[PDB]
């Protein structure tokens, strides 16, 4: 029915599914709570607009990572907000230091969190080629399970989509200390 292993793309309903699972397997990740500061999208539940993780350490530095849903590319899109140890907001050229050079120059931009009425500067990873990446990563995971089994139902389910997405993001943000381990 779903073509997500074929397209690397998710629907809004599937985004919510993968988010719930991510929030379950890793409770450091939480859905947004309802707030008047939030610019709501009609195509998502009010309490399931975007995913938040708080103060992930770097190097000191700390990051709030946000996972929103890109409607144009039907993929998740990430936003990072950095802070110094004293809690002072980091600067765009500081935040660029914590992003892989090659991937930084090609995908990263500075913009406010689009889901907040109140302006909060962040670094935006453009999701232009996320679908192609996920398409490859999901099938690669499948091969690993295929080899592990050999000692078809090895393909992942869609609510596991975001964990694969985060494993991808972690590689692009190495200094940010978060990792996602399964099996």
Author numbering: 19 to 77, 166 to 257, 277 to 308
Quote the passages of the study that discuss this structure, keeping the authors' original sentences.
Many facets of autophagy rely on the autophagy-specific ubiquitin-like protein (UBL) Atg8 in yeast (or six LC3- and GABARAP-family UBLs in higher eukaryotes, here referred to collectively as Atg8-family members) and the E1–E2–E3 enzymatic cascade that links Atg8′s C-terminus to the primary amino head group of phosphatidylethanolamine (PE) lipid molecules. The central enzyme in the Atg8 lipidation cascade is the E2, Atg313,24. Atg3 receives Atg8 from the E1 Atg7, to form a covalent, reactive Atg3~Atg8 intermediate linked by a thioester bond (referred to by ~) between the C-terminus of Atg8 and the catalytic Cys of Atg3. In addition, Atg3 displays unique, functionally important structures: an N-terminal amphipathic membrane-binding helix (N, residues 1–18); an intrinsically disordered flexible region (FR, residues 85–159); a handle region consisting of a helix and a disordered region (HR, residues 237–282) that contains an Atg8-interacting motif that is dispensable for the lipidation reaction but plays important roles in vivo; and a flexible extreme C-terminal extension (C, residues 299–310).
To illuminate roles of Atg3E123IR-binding to the Atg3cat, we determined a crystal structure lacking these interactions for comparison to the prior structure of full-length Atg3. The structure of a version of Atg3 lacking the N-terminal 18 residues and the FR region (Atg3∆NFR), determined at 2.5 Å resolution, superimposes well overall with that of full-length Atg3 (0.48 root-mean-square deviation over C-alphas). However, there are substantial differences in the catalytic Cys loop and adjacent regions. In the structure of full-length Atg3, the catalytic Cys234 is sequestered in a pocket formed by side chains from the HR and two loops. This orientation is catalytically incompetent, with the Cys distal from the structurally important Thr213 and from two other side chains (Tyr179 and His232) that are important for the lipidation reaction (right). By contrast, in the absence of the Atg3E123IR element, Atg3′s catalytic center is structurally rearranged into an activated conformation through a domino-like effect that ultimately results in remodeling a loop observed in full-length Atg3 into an additional helical turn at the N-terminus of the HR; the remodeled helix cannot restrain the side-chain from catalytic Cys234, thereby allowing the alternative orientation where Cys234 is surrounded by additional key catalytic residues (left). Moreover, it appears that the extreme C-terminal region of Atg3 also rearranges between the E123IR-bound and other states: this element undergoes a conformational change and additional C-terminal residues are visible in the crystal structure of Atg3∆NFR relative to the prior structure of full-length Atg3. In the conformation in Atg3∆NFR these residues would clash with the bound E123IR, although their nearby location also suggests potential to positively interact with the E123IR in an alternative, presently unknown conformation.
